[PDB]
Amino acid sequence: MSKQFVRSAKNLVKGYSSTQVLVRNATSNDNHQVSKDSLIELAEKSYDSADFFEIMDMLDKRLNDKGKYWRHIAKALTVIDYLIRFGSENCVLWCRENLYIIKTLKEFRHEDDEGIDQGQIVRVKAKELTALLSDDERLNEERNMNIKGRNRKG
Amino acid sequence: MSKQFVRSAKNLVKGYSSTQVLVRNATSNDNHQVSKDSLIELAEKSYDSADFFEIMDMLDKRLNDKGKYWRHIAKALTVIDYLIRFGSENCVLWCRENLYIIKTLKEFRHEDDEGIDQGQIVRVKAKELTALLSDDERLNEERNMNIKGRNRKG
Amino acid sequence: DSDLQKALKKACSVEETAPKRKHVRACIVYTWDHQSSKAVFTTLKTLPLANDEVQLFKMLIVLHKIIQEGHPSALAEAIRDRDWIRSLGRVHSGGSSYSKLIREYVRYLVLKLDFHAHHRGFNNGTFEYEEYVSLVSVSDPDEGYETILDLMSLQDSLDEFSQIIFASIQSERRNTECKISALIPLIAESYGIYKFITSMLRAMHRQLNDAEGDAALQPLKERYELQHARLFEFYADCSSVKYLTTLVTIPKLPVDAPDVFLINDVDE
Amino acid sequence: DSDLQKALKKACSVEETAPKRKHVRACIVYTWDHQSSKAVFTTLKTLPLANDEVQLFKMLIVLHKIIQEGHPSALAEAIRDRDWIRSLGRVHSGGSSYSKLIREYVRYLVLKLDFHAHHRGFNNGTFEYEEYVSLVSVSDPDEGYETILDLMSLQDSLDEFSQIIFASIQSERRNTECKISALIPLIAESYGIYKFITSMLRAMHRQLNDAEGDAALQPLKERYELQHARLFEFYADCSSVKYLTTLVTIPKLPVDAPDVFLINDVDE
Amino acid sequence: DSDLQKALKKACSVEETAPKRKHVRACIVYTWDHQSSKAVFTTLKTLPLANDEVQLFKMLIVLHKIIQEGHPSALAEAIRDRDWIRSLGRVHSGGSSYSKLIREYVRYLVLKLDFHAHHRGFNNGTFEYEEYVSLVSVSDPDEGYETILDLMSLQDSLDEFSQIIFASIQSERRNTECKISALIPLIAESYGIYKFITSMLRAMHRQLNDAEGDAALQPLKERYELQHARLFEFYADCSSVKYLTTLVTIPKLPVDAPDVFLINDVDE
Incomplete structure (x- = not known):
């Protein structure tokens, strides 16, 4: 509530891009989960090179950050998954080449300070991400559903 | 860590029974989950009337307590479930009669103060509890496995 | 009697x-009890006589559980009184989603009350293998x-229920806590009716x-068989519609069908 | 079930x-209720298995009201179990008044349990003019x-009850709160039995x-008629005995007798 | 009589x-004495009427020796009174080991009292070669x-005794001084019954x-012969179970068997 206004102020001073702000916003300090509507806006605006390359790079870095920042890891995987389904053609083409790199994100163990396995939530969400990318045919089917579905409405 | 020693001190002053202490211990203030080994000791010592009637009564009351006490609700369901499988014959016979009362613990909605649905974890765990009790034949099969299994070892 | 009524008011x-x-x-315990069984239904x-469709919406989700x-x-309690919820005919509310849903939803429950008029005996809860x-x-x-024909009228009303709403359910026309609360008993009954017949x-x-x-027997089975295709599409569309993926919200229908038609015609 | 049991413990x-x-x-409300009807009788x-005759004395006054x-x-609940209160045979207590009264009082109630074995249907509370x-x-x-012969065995036990006590009741052998508490249900039943037969x-x-x-019919009436004289003396002596003069403690028996014998023999 | 009763209280x-x-x-000397033979059995x-299963547990080990x-x-003393230890039906105790053992152990001794109802004469102590x-x-x-069929019911109860306990005995479900005390008379009788029949x-x-x-004769022998295999496994498992290796706790059964079957069928 209060920490959100401070976080946003720091972003404006540094002058981050529109994508980096939304990513940082998703990785919020509060306990409340990220909204699904926010994932749609990111998916639609994930075509450009200047935006897409930054999105993939930031979310990958969000997985580590530090020991305390555990919320920043779980929120990153949620955004990445949706960018594959309703994202764009450029998203899939890049992920296909970088599939060899993304594949190794399953055994992510971590311990902050006290002694609570925060990577349990991370491991589960990441497991689903690797399962979808492992099947090439499944990815192709998802593309057709999102492309035709978008054309059906407009 | 520190709140645990204080909690235990209050129990000794009032003079609660051995069952009530272990139940309160399961419903700890800390974020760490309850151990599975502790559930075994409760299951073995859930035969006596003086103990069993208190165990069922306390855990049922633990489901409400107050708005803030959300951890006390999730831990209660974990203990109840194990008392059906490896508990005793008296546990099942009583639960059979009180099945009509226990059945209505599925739609448990709750909101503490800020605005976080703490009953989401409660609803999931309670769903499994009702599913097991709904099948009478399944309960009978579980009894044979625990009785014979105990006899196999000793 | 008085203390029990207070529980209804708070809940x-x-x-x-x-x-x-x-x-x-x-x-809902005070019903097998043969003490009075009246004070509960008096309130x-x-x-329901009131015009507002907010408290009434949550009122009709408890009756769906007790039935x-x-x-x-x-x-049998609400049979001696012919009038039930007919007063809700011709009403006007805020959003278009409200009145369009209420006008048909109110009649779906009337059929459930009319179910006892013919069959009388309890149907929705008599096991699968018991005599x-x-x-x-x-x-x-x-x-x-008679008991099967009555169930048909109730089962066909499910298609009629989604007809006025169109497509299937539409989350846009069902995006409140009160509306999503009344969706679960409707589905649980829908799968129940489908189960107890087959x-x-x-x-x-x-x-x-x-x-x-x-x-x-053959006319009863034949009419019920055609309803399968209507029911399959009902949940297939519902699965596509964004909603809580609970077992009680989207059960799996296709289980008994190819090994039912062939074995029944042999007798004829 | 649990909350209801707590009420028994306090009372x-x-x-x-x-x-x-x-x-x-x-x-005593939780009996018409067809939910369980067991937890009440479990306690x-x-x-009664206990040896003390202080808590047991007050325990047997509630059952006399519920029956x-x-x-x-x-x-019917306490029929499937053959054993009831037979364990109280051969006991020893403080005062002579205690054991002398308990030994017969315990068997009087056993007969009331045996009453259901033959007649089964409810007798003590079916109005005077109803079919x-x-x-x-x-x-x-x-x-x-069968139903009349069973009532005779219960009615004759009242004379047997006062036989071991002699004279009638004797306030000296009945001067405690627990003892006078169990006297009222015995009398209310005694007048009840006399009423429902005539x-x-x-x-x-x-x-x-x-x-x-x-x-x-004639053998049933004749045997019951002779019991009138035995019952008249029972309360006539009780009236002389110093005790609370309540309607439920000393009802008036002579009301139906001269216009009953003559009208019955005509049929024969 | 009074001084003898004091010895029971202390022991x-x-x-x-x-x-x-x-x-x-x-x-246990005061029994052949024809002076009264009552005061001992009165206490x-x-x-046993008491609810506690601690003093009662040690109470039933003396009777097993005197019998x-x-x-x-x-x-013959405890036959005229039909009731013995039936009041222990439906009870509840601390550990699961207690009630599970008591419910069957209490009925095993009832059979021993029922043994006198048919055979009457003393069986467990009449030598091996005497007429x-x-x-x-x-x-x-x-x-x-009759005397053999009665012994069969008692012998088969040993298998029933271990059935509710499962496996055989289990030291974990028998790890107290009171429990191990009652194990010796059960075994001594078990070997005794096996001895006096063969x-x-x-x-x-x-x-x-x-x-x-x-x-x-042949039906009596045949039925008793099949019990050997059941009894062999009883002690074979008991030997494996960790317990005091006393002659009275684990006697040796296989002694008379191959030279018994063949010699009996010749007569037929």
Whole structure:
């Protein structure tokens, strides 16, 4: 509530891009989960090179950050998954080449300070991400559903 | 860590029974989950009337307590479930009669103060509890496995 | 009687979210009890009379639970009084989603009250393999034709329910706590009706020689068989529609169908 | 179930004086209820097993009330178990008044449990002029002979009850709160039994032509008629004995007698 | 009478460990004495009536000794009273090991009391080679069939005893001084029953010509022969189970078997 206004102020001073702000916003300090509507806006605006390359790079870095920042890891995987389904053609083409790199994100163990396995939530969400990318045919089917579905409405 | 020693001190002053202490211990203030080994000791010592009637009564009351006490609700369901499988014959016979009362613990909605649905974890765990009790034949099969299994070892 | 009525007032109140399930028990226990069985239903007459469709919306979700679990005497309670919820005909509300849904939803429950007029005996909760407690698979041939035809009128109303809403459900026309609360009992009943009919057929084909009325069976099965395709599309679309993926919200229908048609026609 | 059991514990406790009548209701309401009807009677088995005759004395005054008011299903509860209160045979207590009274009082109630073994149907509470709810004046001739003979064994036990005490009651041998508490239900039943039998005769002579079994009536009336003189002396002496002059402690017996004998012999 | 009763009170007290064997003598001597033979058994009625299963557990180990040694008149004492230890039906205790064991153990001893109802004469202590003092090997053919069939019901109860406990005994479910105390008389009797039956067969085959009832022998032997395999496994498992390796706790069964079957069928 209060920490959100401070976080946003720091972003404006540094002058981050529109994508980096939304990513940082998703990785919020509060306990409340990220909204699904926010994932749609990111998916639609994930075509450009200047935006897409930054999105993939930031979310990958969000997985580590530090020991305390555990919320920043779980929120990153949620955004990445949706960018594959309703994202764009450029998203899939890049992920296909970088599939060899993304594949190794399953055994992510971590311990902050006290002694609570925060990577349990991370491991589960990441497991689903690797399962979808492992099947090439499944990815192709998802593309057709999102492309035709978008054309059906407009 | 520190709140645990204080909690235990209050129990000794009032003079609660051995069952009530272990139940309160399961419903700890800390974020760490309850151990599975502790559930075994409760299951073995859930035969006596003086103990069993208190165990069922306390855990049922633990489901409400107050708005803030959300951890006390999730831990209660974990203990109840194990008392059906490896508990005793008296546990099942009583639960059979009180099945009509226990059945209505599925739609448990709750909101503490800020605005976080703490009953989401409660609803999931309670769903499994009702599913097991709904099948009478399944309960009978579980009894044979625990009785014979105990006899196999000793 | 007085203390029990207080539980209804606290539970069935205007609090947006669904009521406490534990509180509902104490209210819905007092029905097998042959002490009075009146004070509970007295408060459920003056409140539906009101014009507002907010408290009334949550009022009709408790009755849907008690009718699928309680004694059939509870169903018999609201039969001696011919009027039930007919006063809600011709009404006007804020959003278009409200009135469009209420006008048909109110009549769906009327059919459930009319269900007791013909079949009387309890249907939605008599196991799948039982003869003594069940009064459907081993009923009189006259009653057997009536109890199935009554279930058809209720089952077909589900298609009529989605007709006025179109497509299937539409989350946009169902995005409040009160609306999503009344969706679960409708689905649980829908799968229940589908279950208890096809379960009868499993016992019907087994008990053919020990019966007297082969002519009054094929028309009942044939009409019910065509409803499968209508019901399959109902949930197939619902699965696509964004909603809570609970077992009670989207059960799996296709289980008994190819090994039912062939075995029934042999008797004829 | 659990909350209801707590009411029994508080009411039926060692507090010398009689328990609160309001508290008794909540305990004795749960009997028509077809939810379980077991938890109430479970606690009434391990407590009579005890040797002490102080808590047990007050325990047997509640059962005497529930048996004269509640559903006949309550009587059927303690039949499947053959053992009831036989363990109290051969006991020893402080004062001579205690054991001398207990040894016979314990068997008087056993007969009341044995009453359901033969007649089964509820007798002590079926009005004086009614056919539908009553199952005595319009029973089968075989059942009619049995239901009266059973009442005779219970009625004659009243004379046997005062035999071991001698004279009648004796306030000296009945000067405690627990003892005087159990006297009222015994008397209320005694007058009840006397009432429900002679009330049957009022309907019996009216319905003679519409019946089939004249032979099995005169022996029942004749045996019951001789008991009047025994019962008259019972209360005549009790009136002389210093005790609370309540309507439920000393009812008036002589009301139906000269206009009963003459009208019955005409049929024969 | 009074002084003898005091010995019972001191010996049979709550002291965890087993009582003094010397003290038991003075109590169990007063039985052949034809002075009264009542005061001893009077105190063994009000104490089993209690609900606690701690003093009662040690109470039932003395009776097991007196029944295997004393005069058969001692067995006849608790026959005129039909009730013995039936009040222990439906009970609840601390650990699961207690109630699970008591419920069956209490009925095992009831059978021993029922043993006198049919056979009457003393069985467990009439030597192996004797005719005058023994009333089994030289009984009437009608009595001979009855006395063996009665022993079968007692012998089969040993298998039933271990059934509710499962496996055999389990030290984990028998790890107290009171529990291990009652194990020795059960085993001593078990081997005794096995001995006195097979000992009869040793005299039975010898006395075939001087008898009248060959038909009522083969069914008795055949049924008893099959019990050997059940009894062998009983002690074979017990040997594996960690327990005190005393001669009275684990006797050796296989001694008479191959030279018994063949010699008996020749007569038939």
